[PDB]
Design a protein around this ligand. Structure first.
Ligand code: CLA
Ligand code: CLA
Ligand code: CLA
Ligand code: CLA
Ligand code: CLA
Ligand code: CLA
Ligand code: CLA
Ligand SMILES: CCCCCCCCCCCCCCCC(=O)OC[C@H](COP(=O)(O)OC[C@@H](O)CO)OC(=O)CCCCCCCCCCCCCCC
Ligand SMILES: CCCCCCCCCCCCCCCC(=O)OC[C@H](COP(=O)(O)OC[C@@H](O)CO)OC(=O)CCCCCCCCCCCCCCC
Ligand SMILES: CC1=C(/C=C/C(C)=C/C=C/C(C)=C/C=C/C=C(C)/C=C/C=C(C)/C=C/C2=C(C)CCCC2(C)C)C(C)(C)CCC1
Ligand SMILES: CC1=C(C/C=C(\C)CCC[C@H](C)CCC[C@H](C)CCCC(C)C)C(=O)c2ccccc2C1=O
Ligand code: SF4
Lengths: 740, 63, 80, 43, 69, 138, 74, 141
């Protein structure tokens, strides 16, 4: 840790482009400006030292955490002053969650449509109300002081960033101490947080929620301070511990947990009152998660001769096919920030996809399962975040290979031998992509052709040539013969999706078994195909970022270059950046098909209403099994049918969704101008417009230049992603607010 | 069924025996000894014995 | 093959010859500039057409020009 | 002096553009806080 | 011409056709393009995304016209 | 001809020679390294450069020049020779053809494809109709 | 009515922009400030490489190719 | 009356949609006065106030007064932009002056836009608006 590395001053605020060398000679052309924002967070190009790069990264992470805390505090303030949270808590099913009361200036007040309870605002789909009920928050003053705490935490991260960059900045070995870091982040950052939230679940969340789950009508609960001050409130709630400040923790210290089994439960399933998870199960969950994470943060050698060096583990792990195995990966992963960013972005994208696929099927918060808006929104949001982060992990893998790969570090290790048979890897992935594309999409268009022919017996359907997903069905079977079988000490299954019975909260289905048929088989192989092609593009970018048979010196050209000219037949889009650019479209395709499958299968075979007698009437009435096998059925019974809500929205509270549906169509189509053209036309057109300006003594001193080839691709893919995702967003939200 | 994990002398006997077994393991496994068998080795052995005993007690009075 | 011509605006900065990935250009004596050297293209049969030489040229307009013509195995950059 | 280097940052194109746009947004929005729905000059 | 004399370019293909630039050196030797004219507007010259250009070039005496002395 | 040099410690790869090396043409680069070093092959991966003479067969002239520029030249090895090998066995020296590198002006070199005019002074294709004449014709 | 007025101006837009692309390609087919020798490279060529800022879609054929989208849209 | 149009006072459909006027602003009345003001316009079959763009000084407020207002405002904007670009072109730090706006010079330009047309006419009289055709870069042909 140093003392005063950087003088805190406003001098360099006045100088755009101080951080680079090409960016401080004055902007002679327009491109400089774009390059400024293109080069701002490339700390590797600013200076050429790991220490300054790491200090920059540390205090940038501080600023990002400050921004996220500002966001958190904004959410809590809007829920504490501009929402209907207490009214929603009074009547969960009858009240939809809403916040963000728009200002009534030009039309917009129609978007404050009645959500219920007299409150007038935009219906929220983020599931924040459910989060606040699940955490044990009852009134809004708790959320208000949580907003205050979020603002003060944001101020703390802001000051910590200024402090750890400008005042006391760490040295390299502090950053390179991956041992102390991993021990602090398995145990100290994850385990402590899990334990403290269990300390919020043992004492606050479970009491408040158990009282709410009987009809106590909110307000008459004591405040959460009274539940540790008075164990007399803990008397009637699970009596079977002495419940004292010394006596109550004695059963933990004496291996006496059958007493704790009343609130540390392993029930599983769903609460048949709220449609959420059993919060006793989540408390026991966080307890076990905390303990396993604190155990896990005790395996790395820091200062006391106990623990593993990651290096001994890595360089030891090696086999007869992999040469020297992992010899050299330790140097790679403590020298390249990009090699770590690749893994961490890919892993967090996979976690976000997992979070999407988990919070729909074991709905973990009270009254979010029967809030189909919230459920659809949360799944689709986490799927998009996961796809974007995965493509970013591929991007920084390519960046690592271009900039931070050293052949002397990597000799006959797994990195080197992967590079030495990239051609076999890419050719086999190419073959898998073609096979999957044929035997999924060709199946779909075969079905379209036979349905048009009037040959339904010749289709790949449940009434024609059956393709039953037998493996997924048997895994579904083994999860329901397991809340009494292979998981004996457990009340209900992991989720009702694998089997069980219709969990019916209010008049609505919370979760029912999702049976898997031929249409599911087809759309799962479509998902596998789209994932494999995205993998093919991104892995080909990562493995060929350095060289190929076409360009043997791509590492000298860099990570972000347009081409190597029209020769060799034409070498457009050879860079790793352009492979990320193509993988972004293919991620869009994959995630779009995934969320379309989710929306249709949920609306067709799970969601709906439950009659007083007990008959489920699904929203689209089970058209999935016969219409999701053709492209015509997807076009008609999913896209054409369910878009009626977003296009009939003009004149109601859903009006903004129709407006954004159209605006997103516009932005997506605006993207194609950047995607299909090239900058030469635009430079020649800017030339004549420059003539028009030069005639009137008005041509600017900063020369107007068209965007670069890479910037043209970047703008096109950004507008394409923005428009397509926002189209699907507006469609989804309008449809599921109206029918859900 | 929710087992009979309660305060027994046998629970403490198992905990002490597991602590002794972890001390023996540390006297047979742990590579770095110049650190601190010093306090760091002793605390490590004690915590490992505690974890193994927490497993063993649950397994015994869950059987 | 591709045709790489050099025009007498060449200043002899040598940057096109150093930018060539396929050893097409060289510098030969010439009294027409201060530097005393002009680029030459004696090996256009090994030209791939990448136009790195034109990217390297500082003169306005370029003193080196690549005209992409007939395509062969060498000019298509084929390792097979 | 640092407030002269703040005068320079609060004179850049992104800052001046954003400030003037916020100003003109205020001019229009607080004109529809008053006389509304003006498709035409009433004459 | 001479150093410091503003000259208008008459080369068709030059980026600064019908534009004025200052001479920095006239070569005394008998080369084809001895006039070294520097400009304020930079070239297109550079790779894609390069925030720079070329503001000087070599012209013959028949391709420049002395505007001022 | 009869190119001499030890093969570097290269574990083999799928990015090396194909059928064109055996039926059409291949290339070699020879160089002399003063010590055992590590370098990156153009066909991906790390190889170990021997002391003395190294001989490497590649599929393209561009790969040989990429190895010579990005690997040999930063390691101060400027003695390399690039040969084109024909499938019968005939080799021709290619890159240091006269011994001096092409970026250094050598007396003994003649000007090829030099056009004694500017780019703007070229003829117009309309005048240059039916004929073998091209606008860049000398 | 007003719908016809607004669509007629959409058509005027479409005609003017398709004409703009085609005319800009025709009148810069001989050459521009980005490439003042475009006569010698012909009508259809890919580009002049990533040099001089980048020259994708610079040929006059490329203006046809870009105006075909606008003609289809109009 | 122009092109078969009826005035909005004498249009049944106008009053039919006036009976259910949605409140645009925070005013309790809002749409009431909206339809009352829109009554003066020339409505149609649909009962929406179609605007006529013909000069037609009786129906002048629908285009001509907004046309003049836009022209004056945007001419102010264009002239002050031209003035600033011309007055930074003298100083050699113009490239710095374009991304870092010389604010006092900007206000000095901005306060003069109220006299934008007459001054511009003067340039049209003198020759200080149009640069010559042999002083501007052109591409070859
Ligand atoms: C106390 C005030 C203060 C002052 C006077 C400075 C001054 C300086 N800092 Mg510093 N810094 C500060 C606080 C301050 N900092 C804080 C609180 C942090 C933690 C986040 C940092 C972290 C930091 C790093 C890593 C670096 C500096 C650097 C610098 C120097 C370069 C100036 C520059 O161009 O960047 C000014 C940039 C801005 C003014 C933009 C700020 C961007 C904010 C943080 C985010 C905005 C996004 C926001 C969410 C809105 C999104 C927009 C969207 C909604 C449209 C300069 C002397 C750099 C340096 O030393 O040169 C190489 C550098 O490496 N600072
Ligand atoms: C147990 C101690 C401890 C804790 C709690 C943390 C926590 C954190 N570290 Mg850290 N670190 C530690 C020890 C610790 N570290 C040690 C010993 C080293 C040196 C090897 C480092 C080196 C390090 C680096 C290089 C980075 C971090 C980063 C982070 C943040 C990750 C962002 C996040 O997950 O969102 C969760 C947000 C919260 C949990 C709220 C934070 C509130 C405070 C800070 C937590 C503690 C409160 C306190 C106990 C009272 C996180 C807050 C990353 C970062 O984002 O920069 C800040 C990052 O780049 N750490
Ligand atoms: C961050 C973790 C955390 C924190 C700060 C606390 C804090 C507290 N607990 Mg708790 N507890 C925890 C985790 C935690 N617990 C876990 C993981 C379990 C399950 C094994 C329990 C089971 C428990 C019981 C049964 C009791 C407490 C009680 C208490 C209070 C008594 C003070 C004391 O024991 O010393 C105290 C405020 C006592 C209390 O006051 O009841 C509310 C009480 O009897 N705790
Ligand atoms: C942990 C997350 C993370 C971090 C720290 C980085 C960090 C970095 N990335 Mg990166 N990346 C990520 C995730 C991340 N990335 C993801 C998830 C993707 C997939 C899209 C990418 C793909 C990517 C590419 C292709 C490149 C980088 C590059 C870089 C480097 C410089 C970036 C820069 O200049 O800032 C500049 C940021 C901008 C100019 C923002 C542009 C506008 C964004 C893209 C759209 C925002 C739209 C908004 C969300 C909604 C619309 C708002 C609008 C209507 C107003 C830097 C080291 C660059 C590099 O050269 O590496 C060395 C590089 O070219 N990244
Ligand atoms: C004394 C011998 C013994 C016996 C009879 C058991 C018995 C049992 N253990 Mg256990 N365990 C032991 C030693 C033992 N353990 C040791 C030494 C450790 C390492 C600390 C563990 C760590 C462990 C874990 C992590 C888990 C079990 C669990 C279980 C239960 C179910 C295991 C299963 O798959 O079926 C079962 C009753 C499960 C359980 O129910 O938790 C207590 C389970 O999750 N054990
Ligand atoms: C470019 C085409 C265009 C034109 C000609 C108009 C014209 C108009 N719009 Mg519209 N609008 C447009 C595009 C356009 N808009 C777009 C792209 C959107 C989407 C964001 C909107 C969304 C919109 C809304 C929500 C509203 C309007 C309104 C209006 C009217 C009142 C303007 C006003 O404030 O009073 C005059 C303003 C001044 C005189 C300001 C100058 C003051 C200085 C001091 C002089 C006006 C006739 C309002 C209306 O009432 O409709 C009839 C209204 O509610 N517009
Ligand atoms: C000083 C500012 C200024 C002025 C006087 C002009 C003037 C002109 N432009 Mg230009 N333009 C500008 C800025 C300016 N432009 C900027 C910033 C861009 C990049 C977006 C353009 C892009 C552009 C194109 C593509 C075209 C013109 C054309 C024209 C001519 C026709 C009128 C027109 O199109 O209106 C409309 C102008 C726009 C839509 C540009 C946006 C308006 C900008 C933002 C105004 C600039 C304000 C300035 C930044 C503030 C300075 C004030 C100072 C105190 C700080 C006209 C002489 C056309 C032409 O060639 O005529 C034959 C044409 O094809 N312009
Ligand atoms: C997979 C089983 C497996 O790992 O095979 C065995 C082999 C790795 O075996 P090794 O024991 O040599 O590798 C172990 C070390 O890398 C781990 O320390 O994998 C391959 O060679 C590539 C597999 C082809 C990939 C096809 C897809
Ligand atoms: C749904 C949302 C859409 C997702 C879009 C994902 C785009 C994927 C491309 C990666 C971009 C990130 C890496 C940049 C690196 C990159 O690849 O950029 C490429 C391009 C220029 O890069 P060049 O290849 O020309 O670089 C050459 C230089 O390095 C010098 O040789 O930069 C731009 O496109 C302009 C971007 C800034 C435009 C002006 C900034 C205006 C405001 C920006 C802030 C908006 C709000 C942000 C969120 C709050
Ligand atoms: C949500 C949020 C927030 C809030 C936060 C908070 C307020 C929280 C917290 C927190 C806390 C408040 C935490 C805590 C904790 C704790 C823990 C984690 C613990 C521990 C422990 C220990 C260390 C123990 C130990 C022991 C043992 C085991 C042995 C002996 C005995 C004893 C018991 C001592 C804010 C505002 C930022 C913003 C928005 C978001
Ligand atoms: C349209 C298009 C352009 C032209 C795009 C440009 C010139 C982007 C710049 C447009 C905006 C409008 C620049 C705005 C400039 C100023 C910031 C405007 C002042 C705004 C104030 C009012 C704030 C390319 O350069 C290009 C390059 C490569 C492939 C495809 C394309 C492509 O499709
Ligand atoms: S079209 Fe564009 S990207 Fe492709 S080779 Fe030509 S200049 Fe490069």
């Amino acid at each position: 840790v140093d003392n005063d590395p950087v003088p805190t001053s406003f001098e360099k605020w006045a100088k755009p482009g101080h951080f680079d060398r090409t960016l401080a000679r004055g902007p002679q052309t327009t491109t400089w400006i774009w390059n400024l924002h293109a080069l701002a967070h490339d700390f590797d190009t600013h200076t050429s030292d790991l220490e300054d790069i790491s200090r920059k990264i540390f205090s940038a992470h501080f600023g990002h955490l400050a921004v996220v805390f500002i966001w958190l505090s904004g959410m809590y303030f809007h829920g504490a002053k501009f929402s209907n949270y207490e009214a929603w808590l009074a009547d969960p099913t009858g009240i939809k969650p809403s916040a963000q009361v728009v200002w009534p200036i030009v039309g917009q007040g129609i978007l404050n449509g009645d959500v219920g309870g007299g409150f007038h605002g935009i219906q929220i789909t983020s599931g924040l109300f459910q989060l606040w009920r699940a955490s044990g928050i009852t009134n809004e003053f708790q959320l208000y002081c949580t907003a205050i705490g979020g603002l003060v935490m944001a101020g703390l991260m802001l000051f910590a960033g200024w402090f750890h960059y400008h005042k006391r900045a760490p040295k390299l070995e502090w950053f390179q101490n991956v041992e102390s870091m991993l021990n602090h982040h398995l145990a100290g950052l994850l385990g402590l947080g899990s334990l403290g939230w269990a300390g919020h679940q043992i004492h606050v969340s479970l009491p408040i929620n158990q009282l709410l789950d009987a009809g106590v009508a909110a307000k008459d609960i004591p405040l959460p301070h009274e539940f540790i001050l008075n164990p007399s409130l803990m008397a009637e709630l699970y009596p079977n511990i002495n419940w004292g400040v010394f006596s109550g923790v004695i059963p933990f210290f004496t291996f006496n947990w059958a007493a704790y089994s009343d609130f540390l439960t392993f029930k599983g399933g769903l609460n048949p009152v709220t449609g959420g998870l059993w919060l006793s199960d989540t408390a026991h969950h966080h307890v076990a998660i905390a303990v396993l994470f604190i155990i896990a943060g005790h395996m790395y050698r820091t200062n006391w001769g106990i623990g593993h060096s990651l290096k001994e583990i890595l360089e030891a792990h090696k086999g007869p096919f992999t040469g020297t195995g992992h010899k050299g990966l330790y140097e790679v992963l403590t020298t390249s920030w990009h090699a770590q960013l690749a893994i961490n972005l890919a892993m967090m994208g996979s976690l976000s996809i997992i979070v999407a696929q988990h919070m729909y099927a074991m709905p973990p918060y009270p009254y979010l399962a029967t809030d189909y808006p919230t459920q659809l929104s949360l799944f689709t949001h986490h799927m998009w975040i996961g796809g974007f982060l995965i493509v970013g992990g591929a991007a920084h893998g390519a960046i690592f290979f271009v900039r931070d790969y050293d052949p002397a570090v990597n000799q006959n290790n797994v990195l080197d031998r992967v590079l030495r048979h990239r051609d076999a890897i890419i050719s086999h992935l190419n073959w898998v992509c073609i096979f999957l594309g044929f035997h999924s999409f060709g199946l779909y268009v075969h079905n379209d052709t036979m349905r048009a022919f009037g040959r339904p017996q010749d289709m790949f359907s449940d009434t024609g040539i059956q393709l039953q997903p037998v493996f997924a069905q048997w895994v579904q079977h083994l999860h329901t013969l397991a809340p009494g079988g292979t998981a004996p000490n457990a009340a209900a299954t992991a989720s009702v999706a694998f089997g069980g019975d219709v969990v019916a909260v209010g008049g609505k289905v919370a979760m029912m078994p999702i049976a898997l048929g031929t249409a599911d088989f087809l759309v799962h192989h479509i998902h596998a195909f789209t994932i494999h092609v995205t993998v093919l593009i991104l892995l080909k970018g990562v493995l060929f970022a350095r060289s190929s048979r076409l360009i043997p010196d791509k590492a000298n050209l860099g990570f972000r270059f347009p081409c190597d000219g029209p020769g060799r037949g034409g070498t457009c889009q050879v860079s790793g950046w352009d492979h990320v650019f193509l993988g972004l479209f293919w991620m869009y395709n994959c995630i779009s098909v995934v969320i379309f499958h989710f929306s249709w299968k949920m609306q067709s075979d799970v969601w709906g209403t439950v009659a007083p007698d007990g008959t489920v009437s699904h929203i689209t009435g089970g058209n999935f099994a016969q219409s999701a096998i053709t492209i015509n059925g997807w076009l008609r019974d999913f896209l054409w049918a369910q878009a009626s809500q977003v296009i009939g929205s003009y004149g109601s509270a859903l009006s903004a969704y129709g407006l954004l549906f159209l605006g997103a169509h516009f932005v997506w189509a605006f993207s194609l101008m950047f995607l299909f053209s090239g900058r030469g036309y635009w430079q020649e057109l800017i030339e004549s417009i420059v003539w028009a300006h030069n005639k009137l003594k008005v041509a600017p001193a900063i020369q107007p230049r068209a965007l670069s080839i890479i910037q043209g691709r970047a703008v096109g893919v950004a507008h394409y992603l923005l428009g397509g995702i926002a189209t699907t967003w507006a469609f989804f939200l309008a449809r599921i607010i109206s029918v859900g | 069924t929710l087992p009979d994990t309660t305060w027994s002398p046998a629970v403490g006997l198992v905990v002490i025996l597991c602590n002794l077994f972890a001390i023996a393991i540390g006297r047979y496994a742990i590579q770095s000894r110049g650190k601190g068998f010093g306090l760091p080795e002793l605390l490590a052995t004690t915590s490992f014995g505690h974890l193994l005993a927490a497993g063993v007690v649950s397994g015994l009075q869950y059987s | 093959a591709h045709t790489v011509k050099i025009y007498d605006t060449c200043i002899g900065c040598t940057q096109c010859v150093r930018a060539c990935p396929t050893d097409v250009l060289e510098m030969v004596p010439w009294d027409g500039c201060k530097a005393g050297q002009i680029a030459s293209s004696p090996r256009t049969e090994d030209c791939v057409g990448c136009k790195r030489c034109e990217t390297a040229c500082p003169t306005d307009f370029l003193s080196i020009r690549v005209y992409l013509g007939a395509e062969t195995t060498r000019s298509m950059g084929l390792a097979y | 002096m640092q407030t002269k280097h703040l005068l320079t940052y609060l004179s850049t194109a992104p800052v001046l553009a954003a400030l003037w746009m916020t100003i003109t947004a205020g001019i229009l929005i607080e004109f529809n806080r008053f006389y509304p729905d003006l498709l035409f000059h009433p004459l | 011409v001479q150093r410091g004399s503003k000259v208008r370019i008459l080369r068709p293909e030059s980026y600064w056709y019908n534009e004025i630039g200052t001479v920095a050196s006239v070569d005394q030797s008998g080369i084809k393009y001895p006039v070294i004219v520097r400009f304020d507007k930079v070239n297109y010259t550079g790779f894609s995304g390069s925030a720079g250009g070329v503001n000087t070039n070599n012209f013959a005496l028949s391709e420049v016209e002395e505007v001022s002395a | 001809t009869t190119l001499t040099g030890q093969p570097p410690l290269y574990g083999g790869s799928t990015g090396g020679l194909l059928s064109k090396a055996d039926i059409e043409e291949k290339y070699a680069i020879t160089w002399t390294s003063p010590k055992e070093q590590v370098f990156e092959m153009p066909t991906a991966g790390a190889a170990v450069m021997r002391e003395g003479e190294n001989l490497v067969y590649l599929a393209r002239k561009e790969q040989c020049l990429a190895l010579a520029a990005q690997q040999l030249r930063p390691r101060k090895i400027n003695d390399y020779k690039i040969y084109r090998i024909f499938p019968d066995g005939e080799t021709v020296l290619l890159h240091p053809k006269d011994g001096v590198f092409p970026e250094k002006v050598n007396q003994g070199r003649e000007a090829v494809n030099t056009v004694p005019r500017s780019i703007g002074q070229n003829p117009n294709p309309a005048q240059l109709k039916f004929s073998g004449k091209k606008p860049y014709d000398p | 009515g007003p719908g016809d007025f607004l669509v007629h101006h959409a058509i005027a837009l479409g005609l003017h922009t398709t004409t703009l692309i085609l005319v800009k390609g025709a009148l810069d087919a001989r050459g521009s400030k980005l490439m003042p020798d475009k006569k010698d490279f012909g009508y259809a060529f890919p580009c002049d490489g990533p040099g001089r800022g980048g020259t994708c879609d610079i040929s006059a054929w490329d203006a046809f190719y870009l105006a075909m989208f606008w003609m289809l849209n109009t | 009356d122009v092109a078969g149009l009826v005035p909005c006072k004498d249009s049944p459909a106008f009053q039919k949609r006036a009976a259910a006027a949605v409140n645009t602003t925070a005013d309790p009345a809002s749409g009431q006065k909206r339809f009352e003001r829109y009554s003066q316009a020339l409505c149609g079959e649909d009962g929406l106030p179609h605007l006529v763009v013909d000069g037609r000084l009786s129906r002048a407020g629908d285009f001509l007064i907004p046309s003049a207002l836009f022209l004056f405002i945007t001419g102010w904007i264009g002239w002050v932009g031209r003035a600033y670009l011309i007055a930074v072109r003298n100083s050699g730090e113009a490239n710095e002056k374009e991304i870092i706006i010389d604010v006092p010079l900007a206000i000095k330009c901005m306060l003069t836009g109220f006299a934008w047309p007459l001054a511009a006419l003067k340039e049209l009289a003198s020759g200080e608006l149009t640069a010559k055709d042999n002083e501007i870069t052109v591409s070859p042909r």
